[PDB]
mmCIF file of C-alpha atoms and ligand atoms in Angstrom:
data_model
loop_
_atom_site.group_PDB
_atom_site.id
_atom_site.type_symbol
_atom_site.label_atom_id
_atom_site.label_comp_id
_atom_site.label_asym_id
_atom_site.label_seq_id
_atom_site.Cartn_x
_atom_site.Cartn_y
_atom_site.Cartn_z
ATOM 1 C CA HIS J 1 -27.601 30.011 51.153
ATOM 2 C CA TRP J 2 -30.457 31.923 52.723
ATOM 3 C CA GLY J 3 -31.589 35.311 51.548
ATOM 4 C CA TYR J 4 -34.675 37.246 50.491
ATOM 5 C CA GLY J 5 -35.227 35.914 46.958
ATOM 6 C CA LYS J 6 -37.970 33.682 45.603
ATOM 7 C CA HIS J 7 -35.812 30.582 45.925
ATOM 8 C CA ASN J 8 -34.023 31.287 49.229
ATOM 9 C CA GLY J 9 -36.360 33.656 51.084
ATOM 10 C CA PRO J 10 -38.242 33.441 54.375
ATOM 11 C CA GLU J 11 -40.534 30.602 53.266
ATOM 12 C CA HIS J 12 -37.462 28.424 52.688
ATOM 13 C CA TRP J 13 -35.523 29.171 55.870
ATOM 14 C CA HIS J 14 -37.104 26.366 57.907
ATOM 15 C CA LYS J 15 -35.293 23.706 55.873
ATOM 16 C CA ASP J 16 -31.886 24.780 57.205
ATOM 17 C CA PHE J 17 -33.233 26.407 60.413
ATOM 18 C CA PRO J 18 -36.176 24.360 61.731
ATOM 19 C CA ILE J 19 -36.637 26.850 64.624
ATOM 20 C CA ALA J 20 -38.199 29.081 61.942
ATOM 21 C CA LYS J 21 -41.451 27.299 62.870
ATOM 22 C CA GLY J 22 -40.829 27.652 66.602
ATOM 23 C CA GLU J 23 -42.885 28.942 69.483
ATOM 24 C CA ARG J 24 -41.391 32.453 69.861
ATOM 25 C CA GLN J 25 -40.479 33.635 66.357
ATOM 26 C CA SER J 26 -40.197 37.244 65.226
ATOM 27 C CA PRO J 27 -41.373 39.566 63.838
ATOM 28 C CA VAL J 28 -45.087 39.598 64.742
ATOM 29 C CA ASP J 29 -48.083 41.778 64.063
ATOM 30 C CA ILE J 30 -48.788 44.095 67.004
ATOM 31 C CA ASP J 31 -52.533 44.166 67.476
ATOM 32 C CA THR J 32 -52.872 47.419 69.381
ATOM 33 C CA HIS J 33 -56.306 46.613 70.822
ATOM 34 C CA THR J 34 -55.120 43.239 72.200
ATOM 35 C CA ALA J 35 -51.818 44.449 73.696
ATOM 36 C CA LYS J 36 -52.341 45.048 77.398
ATOM 37 C CA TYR J 37 -50.956 47.969 79.338
ATOM 38 C CA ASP J 38 -48.626 46.612 82.018
ATOM 39 C CA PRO J 39 -48.282 49.237 84.792
ATOM 40 C CA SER J 40 -45.450 47.066 86.164
ATOM 41 C CA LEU J 41 -43.193 47.919 83.210
ATOM 42 C CA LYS J 42 -40.584 50.569 83.894
ATOM 43 C CA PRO J 43 -39.553 53.366 81.539
ATOM 44 C CA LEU J 44 -36.789 52.394 79.195
ATOM 45 C CA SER J 45 -33.345 53.707 79.995
ATOM 46 C CA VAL J 46 -31.418 54.347 76.772
ATOM 47 C CA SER J 47 -27.926 55.474 77.780
ATOM 48 C CA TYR J 48 -26.060 56.197 74.540
ATOM 49 C CA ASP J 49 -24.047 59.277 75.578
ATOM 50 C CA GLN J 50 -20.768 57.299 75.589
ATOM 51 C CA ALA J 51 -21.433 55.244 72.432
ATOM 52 C CA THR J 52 -18.374 54.507 70.301
ATOM 53 C CA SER J 53 -19.284 53.607 66.728
ATOM 54 C CA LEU J 54 -16.466 52.003 64.759
ATOM 55 C CA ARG J 55 -17.390 50.713 61.316
ATOM 56 C CA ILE J 56 -20.206 50.213 58.836
ATOM 57 C CA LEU J 57 -20.445 46.897 56.976
ATOM 58 C CA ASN J 58 -22.539 45.606 54.064
ATOM 59 C CA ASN J 59 -22.977 41.958 55.067
ATOM 60 C CA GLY J 60 -25.058 40.943 52.046
ATOM 61 C CA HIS J 61 -28.350 41.075 53.972
ATOM 62 C CA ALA J 62 -28.320 44.623 55.398
ATOM 63 C CA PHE J 63 -25.700 47.086 56.612
ATOM 64 C CA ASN J 64 -24.520 47.127 60.216
ATOM 65 C CA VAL J 65 -23.176 50.119 62.106
ATOM 66 C CA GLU J 66 -20.942 48.433 64.670
ATOM 67 C CA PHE J 67 -20.023 49.707 68.128
ATOM 68 C CA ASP J 68 -17.298 49.072 70.668
ATOM 69 C CA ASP J 69 -19.042 46.677 73.059
ATOM 70 C CA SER J 70 -15.871 45.769 75.035
ATOM 71 C CA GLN J 71 -17.109 48.005 77.877
ATOM 72 C CA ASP J 72 -20.425 49.398 79.161
ATOM 73 C CA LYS J 73 -20.473 52.467 76.918
ATOM 74 C CA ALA J 74 -23.901 52.461 75.246
ATOM 75 C CA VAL J 75 -26.415 50.391 77.185
ATOM 76 C CA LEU J 76 -30.123 49.648 77.395
ATOM 77 C CA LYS J 77 -31.714 48.957 80.773
ATOM 78 C CA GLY J 78 -35.093 49.169 82.453
ATOM 79 C CA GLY J 79 -38.376 48.530 80.729
ATOM 80 C CA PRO J 80 -38.990 44.773 80.744
ATOM 81 C CA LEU J 81 -35.273 44.082 81.151
ATOM 82 C CA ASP J 82 -33.313 42.788 84.103
ATOM 83 C CA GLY J 83 -29.691 43.829 84.055
ATOM 84 C CA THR J 84 -27.599 45.645 81.503
ATOM 85 C CA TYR J 85 -27.615 45.170 77.739
ATOM 86 C CA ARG J 86 -24.751 46.549 75.637
ATOM 87 C CA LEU J 87 -25.256 48.014 72.154
ATOM 88 C CA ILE J 88 -23.316 45.964 69.613
ATOM 89 C CA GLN J 89 -24.724 47.163 66.282
ATOM 90 C CA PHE J 90 -27.710 48.648 64.524
ATOM 91 C CA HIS J 91 -29.150 47.921 61.113
ATOM 92 C CA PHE J 92 -32.342 48.378 59.129
ATOM 93 C CA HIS J 93 -34.817 46.369 57.096
ATOM 94 C CA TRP J 94 -36.547 48.149 54.222
ATOM 95 C CA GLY J 95 -38.687 47.735 51.140
ATOM 96 C CA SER J 96 -38.653 48.300 47.412
ATOM 97 C CA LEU J 97 -41.590 50.732 47.858
ATOM 98 C CA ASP J 98 -42.710 52.925 50.731
ATOM 99 C CA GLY J 99 -45.686 50.649 51.561
ATOM 100 C CA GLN J 100 -43.534 47.769 52.789
ATOM 101 C CA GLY J 101 -40.222 47.155 54.505
ATOM 102 C CA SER J 102 -40.856 46.816 58.217
ATOM 103 C CA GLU J 103 -40.704 43.446 59.945
ATOM 104 C CA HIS J 104 -43.094 44.172 62.765
ATOM 105 C CA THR J 105 -46.481 45.502 61.712
ATOM 106 C CA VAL J 106 -49.002 47.504 63.711
ATOM 107 C CA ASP J 107 -52.622 46.453 63.154
ATOM 108 C CA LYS J 108 -51.286 44.915 59.911
ATOM 109 C CA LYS J 109 -49.762 48.234 58.808
ATOM 110 C CA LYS J 110 -46.321 47.933 57.251
ATOM 111 C CA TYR J 111 -43.875 50.833 57.575
ATOM 112 C CA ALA J 112 -41.283 51.756 54.950
ATOM 113 C CA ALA J 113 -38.443 50.449 57.099
ATOM 114 C CA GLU J 114 -37.501 49.327 60.602
ATOM 115 C CA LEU J 115 -34.358 50.119 62.612
ATOM 116 C CA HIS J 116 -32.987 47.457 64.959
ATOM 117 C CA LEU J 117 -30.625 48.523 67.747
ATOM 118 C CA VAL J 118 -29.158 45.226 68.932
ATOM 119 C CA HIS J 119 -27.986 44.774 72.530
ATOM 120 C CA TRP J 120 -26.703 41.775 74.504
ATOM 121 C CA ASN J 121 -27.027 40.909 78.188
ATOM 122 C CA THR J 122 -23.670 41.451 79.846
ATOM 123 C CA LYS J 123 -24.318 38.658 82.360
ATOM 124 C CA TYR J 124 -23.437 36.228 79.540
ATOM 125 C CA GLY J 125 -20.048 37.766 78.813
ATOM 126 C CA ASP J 126 -20.123 37.771 74.989
ATOM 127 C CA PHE J 127 -22.712 38.036 72.234
ATOM 128 C CA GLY J 128 -22.217 34.441 71.112
ATOM 129 C CA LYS J 129 -23.060 33.160 74.579
ATOM 130 C CA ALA J 130 -25.965 35.584 74.855
ATOM 131 C CA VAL J 131 -27.695 34.307 71.721
ATOM 132 C CA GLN J 132 -27.943 30.860 73.361
ATOM 133 C CA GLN J 133 -30.076 32.243 76.197
ATOM 134 C CA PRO J 134 -33.791 33.122 76.286
ATOM 135 C CA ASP J 135 -32.946 36.540 77.764
ATOM 136 C CA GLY J 136 -29.673 37.064 75.928
ATOM 137 C CA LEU J 137 -30.563 39.964 73.646
ATOM 138 C CA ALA J 138 -32.726 43.077 73.674
ATOM 139 C CA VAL J 139 -33.501 44.584 70.288
ATOM 140 C CA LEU J 140 -34.978 48.097 70.215
ATOM 141 C CA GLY J 141 -37.120 48.372 67.093
ATOM 142 C CA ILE J 142 -38.064 51.729 65.598
ATOM 143 C CA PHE J 143 -40.355 52.173 62.616
ATOM 144 C CA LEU J 144 -39.487 54.519 59.733
ATOM 145 C CA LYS J 145 -42.109 56.345 57.685
ATOM 146 C CA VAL J 146 -41.399 58.539 54.675
ATOM 147 C CA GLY J 147 -41.949 62.262 55.105
ATOM 148 C CA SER J 148 -39.467 64.811 56.431
ATOM 149 C CA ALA J 149 -35.772 63.967 56.535
ATOM 150 C CA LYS J 150 -34.175 62.612 59.699
ATOM 151 C CA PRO J 151 -31.057 64.787 60.153
ATOM 152 C CA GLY J 152 -29.359 62.225 62.358
ATOM 153 C CA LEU J 153 -29.631 59.578 59.640
ATOM 154 C CA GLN J 154 -27.846 61.567 56.935
ATOM 155 C CA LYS J 155 -24.301 60.577 57.932
ATOM 156 C CA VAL J 156 -25.360 56.941 57.471
ATOM 157 C CA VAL J 157 -26.975 57.645 54.101
ATOM 158 C CA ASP J 158 -23.944 59.446 52.750
ATOM 159 C CA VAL J 159 -21.478 56.604 53.426
ATOM 160 C CA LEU J 160 -23.600 53.939 51.695
ATOM 161 C CA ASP J 161 -21.991 54.548 48.293
ATOM 162 C CA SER J 162 -18.706 53.391 49.873
ATOM 163 C CA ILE J 163 -20.213 50.035 50.936
ATOM 164 C CA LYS J 164 -22.402 49.287 47.938
ATOM 165 C CA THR J 165 -21.627 45.572 47.740
ATOM 166 C CA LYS J 166 -21.444 42.574 50.061
ATOM 167 C CA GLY J 167 -18.297 42.453 52.143
ATOM 168 C CA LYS J 168 -17.408 46.146 51.873
ATOM 169 C CA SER J 169 -16.864 48.149 55.044
ATOM 170 C CA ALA J 170 -15.856 51.682 55.925
ATOM 171 C CA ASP J 171 -14.696 53.549 58.988
ATOM 172 C CA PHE J 172 -17.695 54.950 60.806
ATOM 173 C CA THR J 173 -16.480 56.578 64.006
ATOM 174 C CA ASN J 174 -18.152 59.278 66.083
ATOM 175 C CA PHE J 175 -21.718 58.486 65.028
ATOM 176 C CA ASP J 176 -24.327 59.311 67.684
ATOM 177 C CA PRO J 177 -27.270 56.860 67.614
ATOM 178 C CA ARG J 178 -29.318 59.195 69.812
ATOM 179 C CA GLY J 179 -30.068 61.055 66.572
ATOM 180 C CA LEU J 180 -32.142 58.083 65.356
ATOM 181 C CA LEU J 181 -34.625 58.016 68.253
ATOM 182 C CA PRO J 182 -38.149 59.461 68.253
ATOM 183 C CA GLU J 183 -39.330 61.807 70.984
ATOM 184 C CA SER J 184 -41.348 59.236 72.939
ATOM 185 C CA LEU J 185 -40.013 55.988 74.377
ATOM 186 C CA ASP J 186 -43.473 54.420 74.731
ATOM 187 C CA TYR J 187 -43.179 50.812 73.601
ATOM 188 C CA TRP J 188 -44.601 47.343 73.134
ATOM 189 C CA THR J 189 -42.627 44.315 74.332
ATOM 190 C CA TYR J 190 -42.776 40.554 73.824
ATOM 191 C CA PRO J 191 -40.396 37.563 73.829
ATOM 192 C CA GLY J 192 -39.154 36.594 70.375
ATOM 193 C CA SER J 193 -36.278 35.752 68.128
ATOM 194 C CA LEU J 194 -33.669 36.948 65.694
ATOM 195 C CA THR J 195 -35.495 37.759 62.461
ATOM 196 C CA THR J 196 -32.756 36.298 60.236
ATOM 197 C CA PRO J 197 -31.089 32.870 60.390
ATOM 198 C CA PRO J 198 -30.168 31.366 62.757
ATOM 199 C CA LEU J 199 -33.539 32.647 64.110
ATOM 200 C CA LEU J 200 -32.515 31.942 67.695
ATOM 201 C CA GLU J 201 -35.216 32.524 70.332
ATOM 202 C CA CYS J 202 -33.085 34.798 72.486
ATOM 203 C CA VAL J 203 -34.599 38.286 72.086
ATOM 204 C CA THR J 204 -36.671 40.524 74.304
ATOM 205 C CA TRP J 205 -38.263 42.766 71.676
ATOM 206 C CA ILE J 206 -38.939 46.395 72.562
ATOM 207 C CA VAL J 207 -40.753 48.136 69.707
ATOM 208 C CA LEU J 208 -41.318 51.874 69.959
ATOM 209 C CA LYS J 209 -44.803 53.167 69.202
ATOM 210 C CA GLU J 210 -43.633 56.441 67.648
ATOM 211 C CA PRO J 211 -42.046 56.099 64.195
ATOM 212 C CA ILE J 212 -39.276 58.353 62.994
ATOM 213 C CA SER J 213 -39.690 60.145 59.685
ATOM 214 C CA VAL J 214 -37.069 59.906 56.958
ATOM 215 C CA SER J 215 -37.137 61.501 53.552
ATOM 216 C CA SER J 216 -37.811 59.782 50.249
ATOM 217 C CA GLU J 217 -34.245 60.662 49.210
ATOM 218 C CA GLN J 218 -32.852 58.988 52.331
ATOM 219 C CA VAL J 219 -34.702 55.715 51.784
ATOM 220 C CA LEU J 220 -33.966 55.791 48.044
ATOM 221 C CA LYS J 221 -30.285 55.633 48.979
ATOM 222 C CA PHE J 222 -30.879 52.519 51.090
ATOM 223 C CA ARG J 223 -32.386 50.946 47.962
ATOM 224 C CA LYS J 224 -29.216 51.593 45.927
ATOM 225 C CA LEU J 225 -27.241 49.103 48.005
ATOM 226 C CA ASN J 226 -26.540 45.649 46.596
ATOM 227 C CA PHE J 227 -27.012 42.149 47.987
ATOM 228 C CA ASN J 228 -24.297 40.917 45.621
ATOM 229 C CA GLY J 229 -20.560 41.270 45.915
ATOM 230 C CA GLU J 230 -18.415 43.468 43.705
ATOM 231 C CA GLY J 231 -18.042 42.227 40.164
ATOM 232 C CA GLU J 232 -21.294 40.236 40.314
ATOM 233 C CA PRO J 233 -24.598 41.018 38.570
ATOM 234 C CA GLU J 234 -26.438 43.733 40.433
ATOM 235 C CA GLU J 235 -29.230 42.674 42.778
ATOM 236 C CA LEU J 236 -30.624 45.690 44.606
ATOM 237 C CA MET J 237 -30.755 45.322 48.402
ATOM 238 C CA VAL J 238 -34.493 45.850 48.862
ATOM 239 C CA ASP J 239 -37.217 43.878 50.672
ATOM 240 C CA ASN J 240 -34.772 42.434 53.215
ATOM 241 C CA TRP J 241 -37.588 41.890 55.730
ATOM 242 C CA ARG J 242 -39.160 38.748 57.215
ATOM 243 C CA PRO J 243 -42.982 38.834 57.375
ATOM 244 C CA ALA J 244 -44.970 38.551 60.588
ATOM 245 C CA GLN J 245 -44.925 35.122 62.239
ATOM 246 C CA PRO J 246 -47.564 33.432 64.399
ATOM 247 C CA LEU J 247 -47.901 34.908 67.869
ATOM 248 C CA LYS J 248 -48.670 31.492 69.411
ATOM 249 C CA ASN J 249 -48.712 31.512 73.218
ATOM 250 C CA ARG J 250 -47.418 35.047 73.734
ATOM 251 C CA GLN J 251 -48.766 38.307 75.112
ATOM 252 C CA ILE J 252 -47.645 41.669 73.796
ATOM 253 C CA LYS J 253 -47.438 44.204 76.632
ATOM 254 C CA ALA J 254 -47.680 47.992 76.292
ATOM 255 C CA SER J 255 -45.770 50.470 78.432
ATOM 256 C CA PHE J 256 -48.471 53.089 77.928
ATOM 257 C CA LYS J 257 -52.232 53.498 78.176
HETATM 258 N N1 LIG Q 1 -32.857 41.413 62.745
HETATM 259 S S1 LIG Q 1 -32.419 41.095 64.298
HETATM 260 O O1 LIG Q 1 -33.339 40.185 64.928
HETATM 261 O O2 LIG Q 1 -32.187 42.331 65.022
HETATM 262 C C1 LIG Q 1 -30.825 40.258 64.236
HETATM 263 C C2 LIG Q 1 -30.621 39.161 63.421
HETATM 264 C C3 LIG Q 1 -29.355 38.546 63.392
HETATM 265 C C4 LIG Q 1 -28.336 39.038 64.195
HETATM 266 C C5 LIG Q 1 -26.897 38.527 64.222
HETATM 267 C C6 LIG Q 1 -26.676 37.058 64.373
HETATM 268 N N2 LIG Q 1 -25.340 36.779 63.837
HETATM 269 C C7 LIG Q 1 -25.234 35.648 62.920
HETATM 270 C C8 LIG Q 1 -25.085 34.405 63.799
HETATM 271 C C9 LIG Q 1 -25.054 34.533 65.187
HETATM 272 C C10 LIG Q 1 -24.912 33.403 65.984
HETATM 273 C C11 LIG Q 1 -24.795 32.144 65.378
HETATM 274 C C12 LIG Q 1 -24.648 30.998 66.183
HETATM 275 C C13 LIG Q 1 -24.533 29.754 65.583
HETATM 276 C C14 LIG Q 1 -24.563 29.637 64.191
HETATM 277 C C15 LIG Q 1 -24.707 30.766 63.399
HETATM 278 C C16 LIG Q 1 -24.822 32.029 64.008
HETATM 279 C C17 LIG Q 1 -24.966 33.164 63.199
HETATM 280 C C18 LIG Q 1 -24.112 37.523 64.193
HETATM 281 O O3 LIG Q 1 -24.110 38.449 64.936
HETATM 282 C C19 LIG Q 1 -22.770 37.086 63.575
HETATM 283 N N3 LIG Q 1 -21.671 37.735 64.297
HETATM 284 C C20 LIG Q 1 -20.482 37.666 63.456
HETATM 285 C C21 LIG Q 1 -20.591 38.620 62.269
HETATM 286 C C22 LIG Q 1 -19.967 39.984 62.562
HETATM 287 O O4 LIG Q 1 -19.232 40.151 63.573
HETATM 288 O O5 LIG Q 1 -20.193 40.937 61.775
HETATM 289 C C23 LIG Q 1 -21.426 36.990 65.535
HETATM 290 C C24 LIG Q 1 -20.753 37.841 66.618
HETATM 291 C C25 LIG Q 1 -20.184 37.040 67.799
HETATM 292 C C26 LIG Q 1 -19.781 37.716 68.941
HETATM 293 C C27 LIG Q 1 -19.261 37.019 70.021
HETATM 294 C C28 LIG Q 1 -19.138 35.641 69.969
HETATM 295 C C29 LIG Q 1 -19.535 34.959 68.829
HETATM 296 C C30 LIG Q 1 -20.063 35.660 67.754
HETATM 297 C C31 LIG Q 1 -28.546 40.129 64.998
HETATM 298 C C32 LIG Q 1 -29.783 40.742 65.039
HETATM 299 ZN ZN1 LIG Q 2 -33.020 43.246 62.193
#
């Protein structure tokens, strides 16, 4: 099955998922001089005050912090979006070294990691329906660079030892995702896809310009996770990122001058 190794990694995915070579694949390089300011874009509205986190899961590709999305509790609206998008989960992609790990790049720069806050358009009723629609999902992407610690990340870091291997989960209630945001909500936006199989072209990407800083100790703990299940030879969960894909006939728009 698909993964991030030499024999099952991103260059192989197209054999099982031919949309990997499609017309609106993600991630992409954000060329900051070619992205055009769109004065028509609204400010993002990130309304996470009522978020209800439930569980954290190692799924063998990353770890997901899952939320109660049975009601409009934590939602993303505004910006390029029409309607209301409910937060279902967040996860990260990261590298084996600080110089790689992000999926999007900025003028070819790779960050140490990238946070994806995944939301689905409530007009489609459930996430599985939403992923079949060109406007079904909105993923808020936030870059991580290594420097000072991010206090709001530490509760995530400290539970990772309890979910070291594929298929392990742990209770993860009362986590506030507002503690993972940078100060500014300036962003780039473009139409794209899921960055893992099935690579469905259902995502409005909203990538924040301002990275958050995390400490070396925090990211080192990400890199102690395992792709493998318990009782299997250890394969460190590192470099779980897809590289930039062709932009093709797309425009990246900036919310800011
Ligand atoms: N990096 S990213 O771009 O942000 C990014 C990349 C990938 C994803 C996830 C895609 N994903 C796999 C999937 C999704 C759809 C598929 C459709 C057909 C065939 C295979 C598929 C595989 C799921 O969410 C699986 N969920 C089950 C795992 C769980 O519940 O833990 C379905 C949840 C669900 C909810 C309601 C109805 C049905 C399903 C998100 C973000
Ligand atoms: Zn992701």
